[PDB]
């Protein structure tokens, strides 16, 4: 767990399974522990729901439509998957999450399911 946190993003893909797997008295102390159980569940489900709508429910690595912007990143894939680590990547692409998620969520769900019925 987190052994690859400081490593190459590409290499770190080999730990996605563990990183995902470990996500899961009438006193004040007791109620706080119950709250903890519940919030852990809610956090888990929100991520699963999002993967679900994106069509990535069965995948740890999910290829989707929507190309990359230069306004998001102007680096080659050679830095991204070889020289840069996930913490560093997150530091730069954290400002685009509200752009990318929306682009996938609507466009790639509605266009895709309509074509599938048809």
């Amino acid at each position: 767990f987190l052994g690859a946190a400081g490593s190459t993003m590409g290499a770190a893909s080999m730990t996605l399974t563990v990183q995902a797997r470990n996500l899961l008295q009438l006193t004040v102390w007791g109620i706080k522990q119950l709250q903890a159980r519940v919030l852990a569940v809610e956090r888990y489900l929100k991520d699963q729901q999002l993967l679900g709508i994106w069509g990535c429910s069965g995948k740890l690595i999910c290829c989707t439509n929507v190309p990359w912007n230069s306004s998001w990143s102007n680096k080659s894939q050679d830095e991204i998957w070889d020289n840069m680590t996930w913490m560093e990547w997150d530091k730069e692409i954290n400002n685009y999450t509200d752009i990318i998620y929306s682009l996938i969520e609507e466009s790639q769900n509605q266009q895709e399911k309509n074509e599938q019925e048809l």
Binding site: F1, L2, G3, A4, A5, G6, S7, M9, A12, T15, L16, V18, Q19, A20, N22, L23, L24, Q25, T27, V28, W29, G30, Q33, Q35, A36, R37, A40, R43, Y44, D47, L51, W54, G55, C56, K59, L60, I61, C62, C63, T64, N65, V66, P67, W68, S73, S76, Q77, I80, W81, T85, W86, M87, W89, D90, I93, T97, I100, L103, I104, Q108
Partner: protein, 434 residues
């Protein structure tokens, strides 16, 4: 450059977070008869062989002063004390005029008082005796008419006679989805990037030791004395000094005490200080002079690196015993020891100590607790592991601090940080859905 969005799940990244940690205890050595307050018997045993994982090439920024683990620990400690004291007998029936004379501390501080108390049948009263320490008794009149010290402000609750308050190291562990990071930098002060950071399942056990001027029974600095302060130029801040060597302190209650069990109602029992057997002697603590001086020479030497001034130490300046003395619990007894001979040959420094039974813990005035007497004699051995100092020219003056209990755990929790896992993110690939 035909790069498409890829969704990743299980990405090993995190953000700072504030969550609820849980109690864990490595020791299950104690039974359910000892009733230690921290023996919650609700919390999980620790993993006897916990896994520490070194994260290479990471640089986590730690901050002990803004650390939320300290506040959480503080809150839970207060809660456990109230939960265990709540069900026991109130001593409000004893808030009566006391008739007192001195004990035969003759050829001082212990009073012999009589009471008129309610017996199990409401129409009858009984005359009873108990001894009290002067610190718990306040004169009403100019005559020998006294009251218990807190009856004019609040209720007094008797500590449960069978509950132990001896510290058990408590481990604080994160809930799933969260992780605890720790800094392994030997010279690390309260804030800054740590170049050697590991992740743990949870913290080591920290004993909830209560003290004021001196920090007892904690951990040691590994290489040198490390002085940690939120703002080193602000005299109002507590300066926490962690020693790299412990100093033994030997404390005792030399009197042979006895206990009188007094009924004050229908199953309402009060434990009074009973007769004194043998000599009447003063409580005290023993600190070797040579170890003390060596230690203080090194503390000033290290402090000088921040001030480039002459450094002297002075006795506490004044106020209530809770601040002016080395207040600590040992064996269930509450000691208030004088430190004037420390903060100021080859003998042992003997510090006189005072003892009191009615305690307002953590400045919560009006939540007074009565500590019942312990029979026999008390012997304590403790380790001084640190100091709390404040500041008042070409010379700097340091004096003993304390009072705010938060500083006592901050001094141990400076090594840990809580973060949460955020497993989703995106990056460019040459693979597109179709």
């Amino acid at each position: 450059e035909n790069l498409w969005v890829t969704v990743y799940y299980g990405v090993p990244v995190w953000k700072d977070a504030e969550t609820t940690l849980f109690c864990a205890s490595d020791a299950k050595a104690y039974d359910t008869e000892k009733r230690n307050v921290w023996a919650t018997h609700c919390c999980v045993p620790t993993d006897p062989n916990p896994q520490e994982i070194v994260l290479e090439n990471v640089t986590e920024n730690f901050n002990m002063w803004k650390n939320n683990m300290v506040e959480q620990m503080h809150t839970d400690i207060i809660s456990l004390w109230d939960q265990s004291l709540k069900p026991c007998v109130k001593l409000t029936p004893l808030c009566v005029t006391l008739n007192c004379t001195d004990v035969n501390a003759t050829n001082e501080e212990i009073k012999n008082c009589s009471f008129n108390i309610t017996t199990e049948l409401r129409d009858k009263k009984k005359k009873v005796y108990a001894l009290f320490y002067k610190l718990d008794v306040v004169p009403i009149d100019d005559n020998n008419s006294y009251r218990l010290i807190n009856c004019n402000t609040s209720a007094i609750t008797q500590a449960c006679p069978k509950v132990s308050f001896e510290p058990i190291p408590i481990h604080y562990c994160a809930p799933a989805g969260f992780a605890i990071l720790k800094c392994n930098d030997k010279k690390f002060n309260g804030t800054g990037p740590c170049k050697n950071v590991s992740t743990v399942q949870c913290t080591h056990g920290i004993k909830p030791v209560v003290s004021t001027q001196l920090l007892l029974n904690g951990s040691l600095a590994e290489e040198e004395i490390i002085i940690r302060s939120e703002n080193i130029t602000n005299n109002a801040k507590t300066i926490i000094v962690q020693l790299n060597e412990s100093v033994e302190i030997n404390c005792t209650r030399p009197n042979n005490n006895t206990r009188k069990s007094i009924r004050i109602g229908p199953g309402q029992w009060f434990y009074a200080t009973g007769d004194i057997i043998g000599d009447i002697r003063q409580a005290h603590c023993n600190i070797s002079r040579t170890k003390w001086n060596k230690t203080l020479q090194q503390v000033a030497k290290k402090l000088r690196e921040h001030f480039n001034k002459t450094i002297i130490f002075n006795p506490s300046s004044g106020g209530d015993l809770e601040i002016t003395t080395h207040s600590f619990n040992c064996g269930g007894e509450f000691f208030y020891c004088n430190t004037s001979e420390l903060f100021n040959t080859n003998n042992t420094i003997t510090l006189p100590c005072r003892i009191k039974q009615i305690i307002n813990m953590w400045q919560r005035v009006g939540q007074a607790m009565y500590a019942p007497p312990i029979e026999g004699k008390i012997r304590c051995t403790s380790n001084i592991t640190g100091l709390l100092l404040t500041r008042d020219n070409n010379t700097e003056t340091f004096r003993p601090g304390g009072g705010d209990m938060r500083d006592n755990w901050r001094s141990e929790l400076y090594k840990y940080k809580v973060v949460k896992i955020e497993p989703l993110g995106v990056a460019p690939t040459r693979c597109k859905r179709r």
